[PDB]
């Protein structure tokens, strides 16, 4: 398809499709709890309806009425032997954390899911379970799905030192630990999405917290809550890029996602010189408006302890410093590919056809100077984040065409973002 080329002004006021991590969160904690739960603008995947069926076979119930999300909760113990298996898709988020959650049940569980999901290892996740008192066994010695689960009413407490970086493993035993009877601590390897975290103190739980160390009693009791799930950052950033970019340009983003753990492009935006104004802060539910106008930016700095927070935002990162006066380095970034990178590669053959210099590096790239953007060909090859980027790359080109193949990969996370590109070129 051919985009949209040489844009005088944008202008309006967006709000961005839901978080993913989140929208599960709000469906657990609300199952949980004591009372009634109603979720706004939650995240409409695959992976968070597979969450929604899994809790409605275990006897919760569950309304997708309208956009709005009524749960019914069932208590700490009120989960109820479900008639079937469980069809956890094409999660990883779905699969571990109730894992974790079915900890206290007594009963024998099956947990299954897609040809993506039986290749990935639950190992991680068993091992902890297990030294609870847990029985839980997949295939082969790496515990692949399907899994097999069978919980006890005598939940032991856990003290464990977590080997990987993993939130998702993190989170399962913090749902276990909340069905146990003691004090149970969960160490941290590196610092990770902290979501499960704020969700528990907003259901009427209880936490502790020593840098790194989550001190978490049992067993608790939940209170249902009013749940507005905040907007994804990873979704608003392609146009607090833009709005920076564009010139004549503001424009509005209504409740975003302000987690400090995936916050990084708002402290590179910040370092540049970019304004960004933040308004609105929600401090329970951690999401605050964000507003963006035209500005000139400089190059920064992007290294360690940055990384783990933007590496999501990666490529449009690269767009906002093409734009930049400078030089602008990012390093200690590899695990495109565990130790390998093939995303900065492509983001840098689709950039520096359409304008000046990008420099791919073994850590991460160089990005040097501001850049007068022209036509070029870009395919995404599959990639959602590379068709954002391109589109709102297309805006600052005056003489060329910019021609997008593959362009339906962005309805991966973004359904309606050509509908919100269009309102705010005409706003």
């Given at each position: 398809m051919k985009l949209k080329t040489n844009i005088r002004h944008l202008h309006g006021i967006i709000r961005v499709p839901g978080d993913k991590s989140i929208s599960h969160r709000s469906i657990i904690f609300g199952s949980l709890a004591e009372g009634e739960t109603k979720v706004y603008d939650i995240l409409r995947g695959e992976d968070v309806l597979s969450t929604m069926q899994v809790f409605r076979d275990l006897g919760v119930e569950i309304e997708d009425k309208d956009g709005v999300i009524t749960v019914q909760g069932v208590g700490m113990a009120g989960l109820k032997a479900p008639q079937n298996a469980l069809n956890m898709g094409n999660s990883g988020t779905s699969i571990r954390l109730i894992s974790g959650v079915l900890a206290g049940a007594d009963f024998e569980v099956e947990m299954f899911g897609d040809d993506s999901l039986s290749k990935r290892p639950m190992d991680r996740v068993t091992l902890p379970l297990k030294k609870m008192g847990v029985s839980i066994s997949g295939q082969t010695e790496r515990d692949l799905p399907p899994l097999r689960l069978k919980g006890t009413k005598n939940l032991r407490p856990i003290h464990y030192e977590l080997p990987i970086a993993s939130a998702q493993v993190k989170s399962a035993l913090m749902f276990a630990a909340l069905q146990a009877k003691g004090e149970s601590v969960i160490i941290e390897k590196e610092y990770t999405r902290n979501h499960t975290e704020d969700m528990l103190q907003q259901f009427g739980g209880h936490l502790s917290v020593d840098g790194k160390k989550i001190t978490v009693q049992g067993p608790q009791k939940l209170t249902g809550q009013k749940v507005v799930v905040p907007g994804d950052i990873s979704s608003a950033a392609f146009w607090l890029v833009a709005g920076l970019i564009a010139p004549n340009s503001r424009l509005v983003l209504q409740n975003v996602g302000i987690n400090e753990t995936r916050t990084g492009i708002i402290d590179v935006i910040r370092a540049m010189g970019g304004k960004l104004e933040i308004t609105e802060i929600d401090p329970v539910a951690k999401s605050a408006t964000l507003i963006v106008e035209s500005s000139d930016l400089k190059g920064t700095e992007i290294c360690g302890a940055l990384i783990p927070r933007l590496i999501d935002e990666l490529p449009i990162i690269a767009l906002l410093a093409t734009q930049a006066q400078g030089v602008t380095v990012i390093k200690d970034a590899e695990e495109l590919k565990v130790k390998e990178t093939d995303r900065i590669q492509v983001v840098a053959d689709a950039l520096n056809s359409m304008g000046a210099d990008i420099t791919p590096t073994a850590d991460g790239m160089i990005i040097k100077g501001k850049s007068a953007l022209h036509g070029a060909r870009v395919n995404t090859f599959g990639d959602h984040r590379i068709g954002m980027m391109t589109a709102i790359a297309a805006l600052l080109v005056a003489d060329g065409e910019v021609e997008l193949d593959?362009?339906?990969?962005?309805?991966?996370?973004?359904?309606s973002f050509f509908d919100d590109l269009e309102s705010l070129i005409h706003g």
């Open positions: 593959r362009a339906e990969a962005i309805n991966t996370s973004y359904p």
